[PDB]
Design a protein around this ligand. Structure first.
Ligand SMILES: O=C([O-])c1ccc[nH]1
Lengths: 362, 351
């Protein structure tokens, strides 16, 4: 019959596990990609970017997505020890790491049996192979259940404060700002809201989005960054605006601007790792101490520094002469993700918006 | 716990068509089933339409068994703010879905399929046009719009600089629209100009509502102008004109907007500039086309609107048919974990 019309209809389709980590979307694509050339997760990401970028666009943007959508493609692992390969994507490009989506992915690996649950277990390890290195996750099980996840935590790739007290001149009305740059899986410009002359509130979202874009543009133009072990990482993809908390349980509140100036509704896992490295570098957070970060929505992530390391003969701008090498810390983050749908994305060839669009200005 | 749907769009404008998972909903006509959803179960709409499952320009509907005689499919429309269609674009989507997926059957060797929708507002009569050599591939859909009419003509509304005073026509096609040339506002219609068109459209809407006080003659509940339709020269030379409808809480229609097309049509038609059976083509801000024609006109004795002249016996009203294409962009199973702090959604949109 017209089951031939269904073969046809599904041609070039993708299956996804639609999730969110505390309000922030994680559209996890589980099939429909062909083989993508590349020896590692970094090379697969570049391949996707240089040759098949219309895929990111149609999956992330209206009408299938929206100006603040986020997601990822899964792959077989390449790296030894890894359960899953993952490349992240968004409305602008491809982050080398993402905490909220890594939490979601750990959760989904376990809740759908991608990874199997050792009979009588409380914690299930799930190791993601990312463009930034191995990320070791743990799904913390709902104690009297088979595969029901309470929350998920990740041990991030080594994070470190990169350059301190950088002056960036933005145009009026914002003027001159002081920022730290730090790596937490992505490079971040960390800036106090107080300096943008704007409060973190829903009401000021569009202005915090403008200001993040200008800051990100101006940093990349003025300041060259380079990850000392990962040559492919050499820009600042995200801006962290922080300010006083609203939930008293939380050290601070933040919004992250990234992608095509979209805002994280989560507190942002990599950005959390990046603030933690910074305070820790400054002797303002101790190993083991709990740091709680609140989002614009009021979502919470919990973090702690599990250890530190000094790497002899490797310096970054912030590394003083009196130091024997650069400081990195290993940060853990914990949060909760939910499955919000099992989606099959279709692309009618006659659809003028099979490759997505945004009405976002300029 | 879970809902099934067909994600669609009508030339860019989202239409989430929920095809199962609602509980049993009472009502002896669709308007009562809509009231019951509103009064007892609004949370379903919110979680299906708002982030994270949705977004601030999401629209859609719930499919039901039809009740009205003649009807093929029951439906209640919804969006992130409420329970109306607006622009009518879900109707095109649902007519298409119904044929595409088997809800409605196709007579053999048939080229066009009637799909009649049972909505809270009355029957909506549509036709699915079949792709030449196929049995249920839909090329497009036509909808018979609610009766439309020019209401008031050459209205002078005074806007703050830089817009100034602006000549508009006010016309009904499901909502009342203020139809206003882009030239009049001094903004060229483009995506990059959209926020300027938005500012201006709101300015215009508040200014008209404050000064002109419009009233549907047979529908007293409709006493404002909720949409501003900004038109100008087309980019596609197949199209008569190009437009963007500004409506809601600072929102733009990505489609040409079917009811605005029907309003624009009754306007041209009243001024002697469109003929019955003439294909009018309208382009959106993203380049899509809708096609309309006026099928017929009527007079309504003893009922008058401002544009109705002293010697005319009743207002002029027209019936237009609006054609457009809806695409299927997904088949989704949505889930609501009861412990999900966002099972009923959120919005970061502010006013
Ligand atoms: O969770 C994160 O690391 C992240 C980065 C951008 C959005 N979320």
């Amino acid at each position: 019959h017209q089951q031939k019309r269904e073969i046809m209809r599904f041609k070039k389709s993708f299956t996804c596990i639609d999730m969110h980590t505390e309000g922030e979307a994680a559209r996890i694509v589980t099939s429909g990609l062909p083989h993508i050339p590349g020896s590692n997760m970094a090379e697969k990401k570049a391949y996707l970017q240089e040759n098949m970028d219309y895929l990111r666009r149609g999956i992330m943007l209206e009408p299938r997505g929206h100006d603040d959508m986020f997601g990822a493609f899964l792959f077989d692992p390449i790296e030894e020890g890894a359960d899953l390969g993952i490349v992240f994507m968004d409305t602008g490009g491809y982050l080398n790491m993402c905490g909220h989506n890594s939490i979601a992915a750990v959760t989904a690996a376990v809740e759908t049996g991608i990874v199997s649950v050792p009979a009588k277990a409380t914690n299930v390890p799930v190791v993601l192979d990312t463009p930034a290195g191995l990320v070791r996750g743990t799904a913390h099980l709902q104690s009297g259940t088979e595969s029901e996840v309470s929350n998920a935590s990740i041990i991030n790739v080594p994070s470190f404060l990169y350059q301190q007290d950088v002056v960036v001149v933005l145009p009026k009305p914002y003027g001159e700002v002081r920022v730290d740059i730090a790596f937490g899986g992505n490079f971040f410009a960390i800036v106090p809201a107080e300096q943008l002359g704007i409060d973190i509130s829903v009401q000021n979202l569009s202005r915090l989005q403008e200001a993040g874009e200008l800051l990100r543009t101006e940093i990349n133009r003025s300041v060259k960054v380079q990850h000392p072990q990962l040559p492919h990482i050499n820009t600042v993809d995200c801006v962290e605006i922080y300010g006083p908390p609203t939930n008293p349980e939380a050290n601070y509140k933040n919004v992250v601007i990234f992608g095509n100036r979209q805002a994280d509704r989560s507190p942002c896992g990599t950005g959390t790792s990046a603030k933690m490295a910074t305070l820790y570098a400054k002797g303002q957070l101790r190993i083991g101490e709990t740091f709680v970060y609140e989002s614009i929505l009021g979502s919470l992530f919990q973090g702690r520094v599990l250890g530190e390391e000094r790497i002899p003969g490797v310096k970054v701008p912030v590394t003083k002469d009196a130091e024997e090498g650069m400081l990195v810390v290993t940060a853990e983050i914990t949060g909760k993700a939910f499955i919000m749908g099992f989606n099959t994305m279709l692309f009618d060839p006659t659809d003028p918006f099979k490759n997505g669009f945004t009405l976002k200005q300029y």
